[PDB]
Design a protein around this ligand. Structure first.
Ligand SMILES: N[C@@H](CC(=O)O)C(=O)O
Ligand SMILES: N[C@@H](CC(=O)O)C(=O)O
Lengths: 227, 227
């Protein structure tokens, strides 16, 4: 049976919610034995991803990812790293440990190709500095980049509200204002913590905003993707 | 740093919620790097626990638990099996693979000793047939046992409502009636799926019912317990 391995804890709140999403969007018919098989390494002790870029110590962070990719390679058939920023480490990791990897950047790119309208990348100065989406996506010309100021506001929302487990709807007004400012009805979850916003929007039936949210997509398409 | 290993998927919904509880009751102060380190094996493909008792095939189930205890022994410092019924397998597992195990039966027993009033065991004919609580608890004389009829009603709630991700508050009226019938203000989560009820009661501020819920306790006391 196909096992998904999740390298998460980046952050832990969104990692737990992602595991919840997997079973929410893959409810069984008769027996639980149908449901997704998942291994989650939720290690918050991973060095901060943006923090490792802003200081010297990217080597420390790449080692964390490399060791845990070795573990999950043996245990799982497909692997997801529960942080977009964390994907910056991948050029340094050997090709053999990335065969089973499903890239959050690629999953985003696929959904944006289908959607085919301009979309606001919500991230994370670290993700922006590393240019993961601009360098990774075939659809890069459909990605609207936040200004440096609004990147810092998004960083504040992530760390002050989302990573702390607070109600993701509390930032919805600020997100709507950004969406209006940049003249778009959609966002990309460039930070995985926007999985938490995306879920709260779907729960309240707010369908005015189009969320290109890789973790939602992975959860929804688990049976198709996990081979 | 201390790692909790969770052998779950029994069921998957409650396993995901348990991981959520860990980070809800251990919010960080400054940095995420403070937060609990957790490995979750969520394998719904484990044979049904009551089902393995009601047919011949307990050996199949004990093997599942044994193999995954070997995995988690190498990876984690403490281990929890996210099913009370599943603890029936432990007499057959070698002593070396259970050194790091935190028993849900024992955690329940500890809380019931402190609470020291009669309490209704909610389970699971399989858990009742195996007598895990009656044989495991020093506080067995404080455990009120459901009749065989009400055991089947509890089984219906677990499988028809709780394991399917439906609103746990939908069974609250039936649970209050049982609590009144058996003349008590407290229950034990003899099934781990009552972690889901316990959370919904705490969320709505309903403090009339005392929930002896091992997964809540483990989440709350993570720093104390996980060594
Ligand atoms: N979860 C965020 C930041 C982090 O890795 O902590 C991201 O995917 O960019
Ligand atoms: N989670 C329930 C039943 C199961 O194992 O599926 C219990 O702990 O008894």
């Amino acid at each position: 049976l196909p096992i998904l391995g999740v390298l998460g804890g980046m952050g832990p709140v969104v990692t737990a919610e992602f595991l919840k999403s997997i079973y929410e969007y893959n409810p069984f018919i008769d027996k639980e034995q149908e449901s997704p098989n998942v291994i989650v390494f939720s290690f918050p002790s991973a060095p901060d991803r943006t923090g490792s870029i802003d200081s010297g110590k990217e080597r420390e962070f790449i080692d964390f990812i490399q060791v845990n990719l070795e573990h999950l390679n043996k245990l799982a058939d497909c692997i997801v790293i529960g942080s977009c920023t964390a994907h910056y480490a991948l050029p340094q990791i050997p090709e053999n440990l990335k065969d089973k990897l499903i890239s959050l950047i690629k999953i985003a790119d696929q959904e944006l190709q289908e959607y085919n309208e301009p979309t606001l990348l919500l991230a994370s100065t670290g993700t922006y500095q590393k240019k993961l989406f601009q360098e990774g996506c075939t659809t890069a010309d459909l990605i609207i980049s936040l200004s440096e100021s609004d990147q810092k506001l998004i960083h504040e929302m992530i760390y002050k509200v989302l990573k702390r487990g607070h109600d993701p709807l509390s930032i919805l007004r600020d997100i709507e204002a950004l969406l209006e400012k940049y003249n778009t009805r959609s966002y990309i979850s460039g930070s995985t913590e926007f999985h938490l916003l995306t879920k709260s929007l779907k729960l309240k039936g707010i369908d005015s905003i189009k969320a290109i949210d890789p973790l939602s997509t992975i959860a929804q398409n688990f049976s198709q993707l996990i081979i």
